[PDB]
């Protein structure tokens, strides 16, 4: 139960979801860009983008705006799960190629 890792930014959040900013600590362009790409591949998402507000802080604000179908939190969850599935695909292909050679 990590209550400090990901935070919904309430000031940058719309009524009834569909728009939100999430602050993620100890993360940088590595996760930000991959997560943004995966989320942008969601047909309901109309706005995905992250920013590292300052280099001196291990911090990352990712912005999600959707249409009315789902919420920004659900879009983020789907994006994270799809990133995991992508990583599984890559791992399986690399492992089978290493074994075969």
């Amino acid at each position: 139960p990590d209550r400090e890792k990901i935070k919904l930014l309430t000031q940058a959040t719309s009524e009834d979801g569909t728009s939100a900013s999430f602050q993620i600590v100890e993360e940088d362009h590595t996760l930000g860009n991959a997560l943004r790409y995966v989320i942008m591949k969601n047909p309901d998402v109309e706005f995905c983008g992250y920013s590292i507000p300052h280099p001196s802080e291990n911090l990352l604000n990712i912005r999600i705006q959707t249409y009315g179908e789902t919420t920004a939190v659900d879009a983020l969850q789907k994006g994270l799960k799809d990133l995991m599935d992508l990583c599984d695909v890559v791992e399986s292909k690399f492992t089978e190629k290493i074994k075969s050679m």
């Binding site: 492992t95 290493i98 074994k99 075969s100 050679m101």
Partner: peptide, 17 residues
């Protein structure tokens, strides 16, 4: 080469300190 070490060796160092 061409032999998996991730399968046989448990990755301890990858745990978050």
């Amino acid at each position: 080469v061409s032999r998996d070490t991730w399968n046989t060796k448990n990755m301890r160092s990858l745990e978050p300190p």
